[PDB]
């Protein structure tokens, strides 16, 4: 209802099929912040599981 795009679209399409289900991802403002740090000379990143 704010950020993630795949989810919002998918679920719209799904409740119109009477489906009350979710399929999350990751937000966008988060990755925005990542870029805006890496601008500052920063090796921020993420660890695989």
């Amino acid at each position: 209802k704010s950020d993630d795009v795949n989810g919002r679209t998918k679920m719209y399409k799904n409740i119109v099929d009477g489906n009350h289900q979710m399929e999350p991802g990751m937000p966008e403002s988060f990755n925005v912040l990542l870029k805006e740090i890496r601008s500052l000379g920063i090796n921020i990143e993420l660890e695989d599981e």
Binding site: D4, P24, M26, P27, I37, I42, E47
Partner: protein
């Protein structure tokens, strides 16, 4: 003290949220930091479940997955 305990924290992200994020991330990136994602906030920003409420019952599954890779 209260606020200084907020800043002086194991993790850094919730510390990096609200009061002088500058010094936080400076002294962090010099140090090779890494948070291990058990705070609430830490799970908020990603949007993952909290380790808590209803979600503790699944986060414990994730914890023994951390043990069992």
């Amino acid at each position: 003290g209260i606020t200084k305990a907020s800043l002086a924290t194991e993790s850094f992200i919730s510390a990096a949220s609200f009061q002088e994020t500058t010094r936080v991330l400076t002294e962090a990136a010099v140090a090779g930091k890494r948070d291990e994602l058990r705070g609430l906030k830490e799970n908020v920003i990603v949007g993952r479940l909290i380790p808590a409420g209803t979600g503790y019952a699944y986060h414990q599954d994730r914890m023994r997955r951390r043990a069992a890779g």
